[PDB]
Motif scaffolding. Structure first.
Motif, PDB file in Angstrom:
ATOM      1  N   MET A  20      10.632   2.365  -3.299  1.00 29.96           N
ATOM      2  CA  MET A  20       9.484   2.134  -3.691  1.00 29.96           C
ATOM      3  C   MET A  20       9.321   1.503  -4.742  1.00 29.96           C
ATOM      4  O   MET A  20       8.090   0.914  -5.304  1.00 29.96           O
ATOM      5  CB  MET A  20       8.345   3.306  -3.224  1.00 29.96           C
ATOM      6  CG  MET A  20       8.247   3.690  -1.852  1.00 29.96           C
ATOM      7  SD  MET A  20       6.867   4.539  -1.362  1.00 29.96           S
ATOM      8  CE  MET A  20       6.953   5.885  -2.457  1.00 29.96           C
ATOM      9  N   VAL A 251       2.619   4.070  -0.731  1.00 29.14           N
ATOM     10  CA  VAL A 251       2.978   3.773   0.599  1.00 29.14           C
ATOM     11  C   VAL A 251       1.931   3.078   1.512  1.00 29.14           C
ATOM     12  O   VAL A 251       1.914   1.957   2.049  1.00 29.14           O
ATOM     13  CB  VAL A 251       2.946   5.179   1.653  1.00 29.14           C
ATOM     14  CG1 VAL A 251       3.196   4.731   3.347  1.00 29.14           C
ATOM     15  CG2 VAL A 251       4.265   6.085   1.412  1.00 29.14           C
ATOM     16  N   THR A 252       0.595   3.425   1.064  1.00 34.74           N
ATOM     17  CA  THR A 252      -0.595   2.820   1.668  1.00 34.74           C
ATOM     18  C   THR A 252      -1.311   1.333   0.779  1.00 34.74           C
ATOM     19  O   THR A 252      -1.820   0.737   1.599  1.00 34.74           O
ATOM     20  CB  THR A 252      -1.954   3.710   1.824  1.00 34.74           C
ATOM     21  OG1 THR A 252      -2.319   3.735   0.704  1.00 34.74           O
ATOM     22  CG2 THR A 252      -1.012   4.837   2.539  1.00 34.74           C
ATOM     23  N   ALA A 278       2.093   9.916   5.997  1.00 34.78           N
ATOM     24  CA  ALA A 278       2.332   8.316   5.657  1.00 34.78           C
ATOM     25  C   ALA A 278       3.771   8.439   5.406  1.00 34.78           C
ATOM     26  O   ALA A 278       4.431   7.354   5.734  1.00 34.78           O
ATOM     27  CB  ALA A 278       1.773   8.438   4.345  1.00 34.78           C
ATOM     28  N   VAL A 279       4.612   9.193   4.721  1.00 31.18           N
ATOM     29  CA  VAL A 279       6.115   8.864   4.392  1.00 31.18           C
ATOM     30  C   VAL A 279       6.898   9.232   5.411  1.00 31.18           C
ATOM     31  O   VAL A 279       7.726   8.327   5.817  1.00 31.18           O
ATOM     32  CB  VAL A 279       6.278  10.242   3.228  1.00 31.18           C
ATOM     33  CG1 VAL A 279       7.928  10.076   2.962  1.00 31.18           C
ATOM     34  CG2 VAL A 279       5.781   9.740   1.800  1.00 31.18           C
ATOM     35  N   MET A 282       6.637   6.185   7.566  1.00 30.67           N
ATOM     36  CA  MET A 282       7.486   4.844   6.887  1.00 30.67           C
ATOM     37  C   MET A 282       8.784   4.946   7.124  1.00 30.67           C
ATOM     38  O   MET A 282       9.436   3.975   7.400  1.00 30.67           O
ATOM     39  CB  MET A 282       6.940   4.898   5.326  1.00 30.67           C
ATOM     40  CG  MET A 282       7.842   3.671   4.742  1.00 30.67           C
ATOM     41  SD  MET A 282       7.276   3.876   2.914  1.00 30.67           S
ATOM     42  CE  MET A 282       8.292   4.848   2.167  1.00 30.67           C
TER      43      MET A 282
END
Ligand SMILES: [Ca+2]
Lengths: 332, 332
Positions: A20, A251-252, A278-279, A282
């Protein structure tokens, strides 16, 4: 477009902080830069490797880079040992590198202390191969780790010395500093970045990690004892909570202020649940893409063959110039 | 047939001592052995080279070896830099060579840190490239001069270390045992072997030297003061006369005893004049043949092209097995 050269160790292991923070940004830059990704198997063997693992991890790295979105039609991705020009240029550059420049290297001295049972010539000489890797492609920019700064400086010095002797043969490469990615820190010590070789595995999330383990790790991430629980960003006083917000934001794409509004009146459990969802989402998608590439041997072979051809066609132009300058009879 | 590997520095400057000892024996053994001659331009650049002179001397060397009788249909003759496998194997072998081993091959124990820091890395690392040159061809025997013994021992040690880890990938090479026989000695110090690097040029006859100079240096050769002057072979008491007889015998094929009978009753001036005539004739012929090859650019190209293709075909088999054993993904 500026030429960017990045060397990837054959591991299969990339932390989410790495992805990221960096790779994910680079993946979006393949139209604006001329990106070259080299899986550096020749460098790996400066330490003794298990032969099956070395092969496996080479393929793991390739499949992972493909799953992350590196596009072999837009960028050049290849395995180092598949391009003879690396080893050829490395020998020539040995002859324009001072022994003292290699003996003073911090990394050589540090690795010498840790690999005391295998202080081999490869361990000493590998900055020359690194310089060859970069200079072969007329590289303008190189993404450098803190521990690789001295190696980049050697590349520049060798290139400068060679050009001063023989004319402008090489480009002088610069550090590749693109705009900040997501901020991601260790889950049990949020004042430090994630490291793939941490003894504390609860600090680190890797891209190919079982989603179930990733969720557990996030659910036990360090947070503070504020009463009442306050989901607010403050790196100094609330580093754990801040890091969870930074990871979710990464993430978002939601801003820190947006997330603080979204989590008004909520528990730390809720923030951790959100981050974990969320993680996990992904990573599960990325892992499905990885599997699709990793299990397709013919596709991996095609990508390696085509990548190596693309790379060799660029590399040979530079090596021919080097050999010409030095005075070698050109191969007929 | 056993495989014999010999590396030739790009010089063009060979002495009649090189020719009548090493090279000529090697010419006549191209049928008993599978001989490989490598013009080692990659080694040459461990010392600074004028580019135009390096290119020129590479061609000079090839044309001289052809003029001397090295036959590119019986033997494999090629320029090192035309075969990427040398550099590729060299990098790999760096990783199985100890820094300590190269350090003990240098003059460092005798010399300052300033000296060591200022040499180029190529000068430090060339023993590995030499190991690679030999091992790449499954070589059984290597002609080694006394000063290259340490280098052959390192090659054997690397080969054994690698084979011990990975299986019988390399042949362990042995020293080539030359024909027992008299060495051509220096013309003004016949107790010393004729040497390329001698600062007293009157000691040395080179193959491409003006025949007038050759004749002059022979007619002034040092001989004993025996009274009466007797033309008899005795290296201990008549070194200079003996050396002249050895050189004549090397040119004409006549045994030493045949020559002693021939020169009965003759003066040393007569012997010297006969040696000068015979050597001048031999070098004149050699030089005519040399010019024939050296001015034939298309032929030199053809020879280099075919030699490198023959060498690469062999080198690639061994490099592939080495890479496979180490654990690299095979060339796609
Ligand atoms: Ca006698």
């Amino acid at each position: 477009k500026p030429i960017v050269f990045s060397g990837a160790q054959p591991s299969g292991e990339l932390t989410i902080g790495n992805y990221m923070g960096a790779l994910r940004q680079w993946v979006q830059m393949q139209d604006d830069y001329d990106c070259i990704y080299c899986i550096v198997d020749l460098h790996a063997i400066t330490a003794r490797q298990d032969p099956a693992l070395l092969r496996k991890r080479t393929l793991d790295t390739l499949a992972l880079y493909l799953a992350c979105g590196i596009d072999p039609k837009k960028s050049t991705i290849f395995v180092q040992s598949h391009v003879p020009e690396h080893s050829q240029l490395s020998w020539a550059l040995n002859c324009y590198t001072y022994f003292g420049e290699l003996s003073r290297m911090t990394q050589f001295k540090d690795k010498s202390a840790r690999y005391a049972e295998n202080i081999n010539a490869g361990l000493f000489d590998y900055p020359v191969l690194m310089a060859a890797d970069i200079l072969l492609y007329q590289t303008n920019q190189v993404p450098v780790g803190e521990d690789q700064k001295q190696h980049l400086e050697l590349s520049r010095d060798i290139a400068s010395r060679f050009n001063n002797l023989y004319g402008d043969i090489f480009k002088i490469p610069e550090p590749f500093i693109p705009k900040a990615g997501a901020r991601v820190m260790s889950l049990q010590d949020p004042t430090k970045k994630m490291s793939k070789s941490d003894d504390n595995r609860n600090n680190v999330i890797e891209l190919l990690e079982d989603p179930k383990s990733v969720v557990k790790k996030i659910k036990r991430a360090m947070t503070d004892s504020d009463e009442p629980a306050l989901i607010r960003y403050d790196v100094e006083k609330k580093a754990g909570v801040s890091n969870l917000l930074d990871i979710l934001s990464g993430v978002t794409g939601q801003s820190i202020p947006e997330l603080e509004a979204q989590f008004t009146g909520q528990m730390y459990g809720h923030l951790k649940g959100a981050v974990a969802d969320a993680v996990s989402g992904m990573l599960s998608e990325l892992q499905e893409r990885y599997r699709t590439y990793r299990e397709d041997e013919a596709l991996l072979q095609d990508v390696m063959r085509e990548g190596a051809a693309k790379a060799r066609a660029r590399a040979q132009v530079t090596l021919a110039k080097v050999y010409e300058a030095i005075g070698f009879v050109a191969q007929p």
